[PDB]
Structure 1
């Protein structure tokens, strides 16, 4: 397991193939081709969905392309199609922008557990749900 060399977790919606205003120079900043994030970017994306910003490892070598294992979208953007409102903070405690419940967010939390690291699910629960708390969202426990 080699350490830091070039891998960076940055790209927008997984449905946006070959970006240039979003990523562009950021993905092709190194020797890796701009084409590498369209022909190979949707090779794993199509299996689930599109339009979801999902981070992926970009460990660039001298071997043209690179090795990668795609991970899990951020809880933030997940709370739009699974929250109702597409917005978020700006006014955290100043006003209650939205709300869910532990019965639904704890329900979604363990799905991301393949990427999450915890001794037990409950922990990841209060973690991700607290992430929801930062958005001005208050859990309906």
Structure 2
């Protein structure tokens, strides 16, 4: 499976269409944009209103593959006390510094100025 392109889009859940960016981003490698719309919408008909970073790996024969990542702190809140100790373990497979507690404070600090309120450690 020879790779010709890896496209980094960012899209609203359930809302993918064949209009830009999808049309041209995958169209220009001659991937079936329709399969992608229907596939991307199906795997995210779920996550309601969120904003989904998705990489599309397009192969030499026009077939492709796609991985969605988990959305931003922001949406992933909706105030609150400490349960960010319940998002900050539903953040990790969702973040980048397994300092478990190095997220908490970041997400929270952020969480606040959102601002849903504090009661944490």
Q: Structure 2 length as normaliser, TM-score?
A: 0.68
Residue number in structure 2 paired with 1:96: none
Say yes or no: does 1:111 pair with 2:111.
no
- TM-aligned CA deviation for residue 122 of structure 1: 1.0
Deviations 1:42-70 (A, max 9, x none): 34224x43332221221222231222322
Structure 2 Cα separation of the partners of residues 3 and 117 of structure 1: 26
Cα deviation for residue 114 of structure 1 reads 1.3
| Structure 2 CA distance for partners of 1:128 and 1:63, relative to 1, 3 Å | farther
Distance 2:18 2:81 in 1: 36
User: Could you report, residue by residue, the CA deviation over 1:83-111 in whole angstroms, capped at 9, with x for unpaired residues?
Assistant: xxxxxxxxxxxxxxxxx445033321211
* Structure 1 unmatched runs, 5+: 83-99
Offset, 1:30: 3.8
Structure 1 stretches of at least 4 aligned residues deviating more than 6 Å after TM superposition: none
TM-score (norm 1): 0.61
Secondary structure of the 2:12 match is coil
Q: Which has the higher contact order (CA 8 A, sep 6+)?
A: 2
Q: What's the counterpart of residue 140 of structure 1?
A: 118
Count of residues in Structure 1 that have an aligned counterpart in Structure 2 = 118
Alignment match of 1:74 (pick from 68, 72, 75): 72
User: In structure 2, how many angstroms separate the alpha carbons of the residues matched to 1:51 and 1:27?
Assistant: 23
Q: Residue in 2 aligned with 1:50?
A: 48
1:1-141 equivalent positions in 2, closer than 5 A? 5-8=5-8, 10-18=9-17, 20=19, 23-46=22-45, 48-79=46-77, 82=78, 100-101=79-80, 103-132=82-111, 137=115, 139-141=117-119
On the 8 A contact 1:6/1:58 being kept in 2, the answer is yes
